[model samples]
Target: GQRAVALYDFEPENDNELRLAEGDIVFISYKHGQGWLVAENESGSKTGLVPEEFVSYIQ
Candidate 1:
């Protein structure tokens, strides 16, 4: 179903596991709030989401 951008208000997901990888920038938008991540080239970033127990490794 196609949805309009203005149709729904911003709503943040409580249990979202969006582990962004290195060199990858992510844009997170929620109800009235938005967040972003800038991956540092020098500091390697996590590539993807893994098990909660697994720790993300960054160089």
Candidate 2:
């Protein structure tokens, strides 16, 4: 998927974790797992574990 409208905040759980600050959506990739999935950070800086509750704009 490409867009994930974050439903809530997800603080970085690890050094490799993405910051899901309020109001910011994310670009999701690879339906590899559950809530904690890998995605491209808004900063385009790093790939990290994202345990964020979000809705996929699957269109």
Candidate 3:
């Protein structure tokens, strides 16, 4: 599993996306193409789409 750390501030523009702030953690679920992915955020305990560039992978 690719656990990720948010790298920048971001707000979800759609109901199917995850809202994030810098330093938030997300567990990458899978790729969504178009430079995006589906992941579960540690904040709200929810799963949704996210911008791939906004997060950095961690071990």
Candidate 4:
């Protein structure tokens, strides 16, 4: 609900994608249908949609 870690590097292919690197910590805002989740980088400077598989929940 709050924290997650990127499983691998992700590069946005479109404007809707969230770019992240492996092991980067992110803040999850909410989850949508079809395996998409909205998250923000640790700095909260960037926020966008990311595939659920790219990140794992952190306690």
The TM-score between candidate 1 and the true structure equals 0.21
Per residue, candidate 3 scores C-alpha lDDT tens digits across 2-48 of: 78898998888799988888998788888989889888878546888
The backbone clash count of each candidate, in order, is: 4, 0, 0, 0
Q: How well does model 2 score by local distance difference test?
A: 0.65
Better candidate number, 1 or 4, judged by lDDT: 4
| lDDT tens digits by residue: candidate 1, 1-59 | 11111211223243344343333322222222233222222233422222222222322
TM-score of model number 4: 0.90
Write the number of the candidate with greater TM-score, choosing between 1 and 4.
4
For each candidate, what TM-score against the reference?
0.21, 0.62, 0.86, 0.90
Selected candidate, larger TM-score, 2 vs 3: 3
Top candidate, metric TM-score? 4
> Candidate 4, 12: how far from true, in Å?
1.3
Candidate 1 off by > 4 Å? 1-15, 31-59
- Any runs in candidate 2 off by more than 4 Å, and if so which? 52-59
Stretches of candidate 3 exceeding 4 Å from the true structure: none
- lDDT for model 4 comes to 0.90
Error of 4 at 11 (Å): 1.7
Lowest summed lDDT across 10 adjacent residues in model 3 is found at 41-50
Backbone clashes in model 3, listed as residue pairs? none
| Candidate 4, poorest ten consecutive residues by summed lDDT | 27-36
